Each structure stands twice: as structure tokens, then as C-alpha cells.
């Protein structure tokens, strides 16, 4: 049906692939961040935000992928093929989910506009030669 | 996080258990329904509604599941066992997705209150022994 | 015909000749930056700005150049000549495109006036011997110096 | 990306594919026309029109493509290969740029809308079977 989840939030897969895949934190770390900062609101019976809804759906989808993959690896005979599957998931869907969770957590925490400006700025930065840029990478911070 | 997607929309995973598993249409049929009725809105850059958001996310996760399963079967040379994983996938992830699509397409087409009342009444009907069970089961509709 | 593309935008090639070649992001980086920030406009049916127009024309010409050079390489069985051909394309036209892509993106982002002032100051800095200039080149950036967003 | 240069000017490549590839005047003729008519404006420090902008960029591009090709031929030892490569440029690079140079000059000279109508009418003419095709092909004219 050709749908982009980021398009409603003013983003795009093109805009998030603008950042390196070695940038987005791990799914464990992001799920922990969420459980810590917005558990009482994700488990809540309220449409608190589109970001909340999307995060719920995304956490559930990661669970549906991990369960399938565990059942699979259990069935497969070769731990080698098991690790091949693991690499495939972690590099193909793991990245998508890292992007998704990062985007939505970051938005809830800082601001959608803040996060998009951060995307463009960090992309231009990491693409710019070091001698002609600020030496310290950008970062998002609630601390003044 | 023990999040239930329906809890936000006033339902629960156990209220939909009022309906059997053989009740829900095929993913194919429900995706066709969506493409027919709410394609322009799902593909929209707007948060038209939580149902739209959730349904977009749901389609993306089904694509992630199908992609993994197909890649697995293809990179595999013994497909006779592929029927086992297909059966597992359907029986589990497939039923969850059929329950998720139906809820949302219905709550868009008819209404959330209407759908919850339908669930209650269908639970009555199907709890009723067949000897005293009318044949004119309840059905969601916009006609008399 | 003696045409300077920059003249229309208040600049020249003498104001950008100072900028070293190590100043410009590689073409792919600059095509990615244009795609990420202005794809919805460049792909639009509107004349939103002379910068958009020039970026469109520049992207098309790079594409034609790449199509000629790849064909040439495929026709060259000597990878040494292929490397010599690539080195020519990267030094003569890759630099020209890198400068043209940078100028227009930077203008769209910051302001043509700001970009020209930056060019003036960078020329002051680069014309200056190292023994007498600061070691940290002037910087054009949307972020503050700390690089922390809130 | 999916950029069409003519899309901003209210056109496409599907609307210029109407005109046969051998319709477009040669690059030399099209540059002489541009010089004569709009040298003082293409060399101007002014955004007189998007057509001027695009035409400047196209001229600079042809120059770069001719520079690469001359260098290549010079560094090339086989005259047959040299002729083949220059033929390739003429068929693929020469066409795109001559189609671009024509569009913009004709627009500057007659009108964007006039040129689009000309494209449509010429498509009619060239679709017409020859027995009913007038020999007086369509042509752009001011007088």
C-alpha cells in the first residue's frame, strides 16, 4: 500500500537513513529507556499521543519478530545458520526498529521539530570534513 | 511492558476472545478492504486517527514478518519443513494480525462503540447453546 | 560565452577558488544532503528558487558525466587508464560540481549574504600564512559551538 | 532522484518525445542563436529568468562534457575508438543537451505556452499518416 510510518510525523526513511546505522542505540537500551520514562503511559488506556500508539505497536511487533526467530532458531539444526538468521534480522529489521524507537522516544522527550533539526544537523555534520566543523558531535539534551 | 493495543481503544485481548479464531477473515481480504476504503488516508501525511496510525504500523510489521519468513524459506533448501513454520506463523502471528486489522477497519467503518456492542452480543450468541441459538447471528452493517 | 553561474548569485569563481578541495563534502555526500533536505522541492513542479533550478541542472549534468565515464571505463580494458580517467574526472569536474553543490545548499540553508561573507572571511584566513593565522578555520554551521540541541 | 528539468517549466520528457530526435538543431547552431540573442543577459549578474539560469548551467555542462571527451580522445590511441566515443556522446549526451538548449531558447524567444502548444501540434503532425500529413510542418514564428 506504499505507506511511510515517519511521513505523518514529518520525517522519512530517507531522512533517517541520512544518519549512520552505527548511530542508533540498541533495541535493548531503547526498550529500557521506554520502560523507564513512559511505561505508565504506554500501559495506560489513553491515546496520549500518536508517538505513544506507534511505540506500543512497534514494541509489540518487535516481540512478534523475536518470538518467531527464537522458535525458528530452536528448530534449525545448525547454530551457524542460526547466527546467520540473527545477523539478518539484526541488520535488516533491527535497524528499522532502532530508527523507529529512537525517533518516537526522542520525539516524546525533546520535540518532533527538535529531532528533525537534529537529524539534518548531525547528517550534515558527519558528512562535513572535520577541519571545517565543530569538533564535538551534536547531541540532544534536556539539561540547560 | 505488558501493553495491550486494544486497551487504548476501549477493548481488550480477552474481549475479542469472545469471537473464535475461525471468525476472522484472511489477511488478504482485510488488506484488500483497507486498500479499498482507507488507502488514501493511510498513505496520507496526516494523523487522521489512532486507528489509521495503528493500522499503518500493523501493515509494516506484517511486511517485516513475511519478509523474514520468505527469506528464510528461500535461503533454505529443505522446504518440506517450511509448511511447519507456515502453520506456526499463521496459527499465532496470523491470528493476532487478523484480530488487529478487523478491529481497526471495523471501528473506522462503523464505530468503536458499535464494534464493542457487536463483540458483546456475538459473545452472547456464541455462548448460547446451539439449540436455543438463533440462526441470524449479529453482523456489523449500515443497513436495516 | 564567458558565463559565470555564481555572478547571478553575487559571487564568482575567484571567491571560491580559495576554498581548498578538502573543504567540500564528496559529491555523494552532497547529493544525499540535497535529497534529504530539498527532494520534495527539487522534485516539485514549481520554480521555488534559482538555487533549486541550478541544483536540478547540476544533478542532471553530473549524471550525464557519470554515464559517459562509466561507458568509457567499460570500454577501457586497462584499469590503469581507468584510474587515470577517474582521477581526471574527480579533480577537474568533481571539484567544480562539489563547489556548485555546496554553494547552493549552503545558500538555501543559511543565506546568500551569509555565505558570501563566510567566503570573504575564509579567503582572509586561507590567504594568511599559518604562522600568523589561527589554526581553526572559520565555520558555517546551523548549530552552536557546543553542539547540543534542546 | 526523479528530477525532470522541464517539469518546473510546465513540461515533461514525454511531451518532448513527440518531437523526433532529428528535429533538434545542432548544438553549434543553438549556441550561436543563444549568443546573438541573449549574450548580454546570460553574462549578466542578474536572475533575469529561470530559463537564463538553466541555459547558463547547460552551457557550462556542455563545456565540461566536451572537455572530458577531448581529453579522452587525446589520451586515446585508436582513431576508430575516438570516433565511436564521439558518436556515443552525440547520440546520447548531444541529444539531451540539444533538447534542453532548444526548449529554453524557444521559450525565451516565443513563450513557454507557445512552445508547449508547438509540442502538441507537432505531435499531431508527426502522428498523422503521411498521405494526410501536410508538408508544411509546424514552425515557431513571431511575424
Author numbering:
A (entry chain C), B (entry chain D): 1 to 144
C (entry chain B): 1 to 150
D (entry chain A): 1 to 143
Paper text:
The inner shell is an icosahedral capsid formed by 240 copies of hepatitis B core protein (HBc). The N-terminal domain of HBc is mainly α-helical and assembles into dimers, which form protruding spikes at the capsid surface. Peptides based on the hexapeptide “LLGRMK” block the interaction between capsids and L-HBs and inhibit virion formation. These peptides bind to the tips of the spikes where envelope and capsid are in touch but are distant from the hydrophobic pocket.
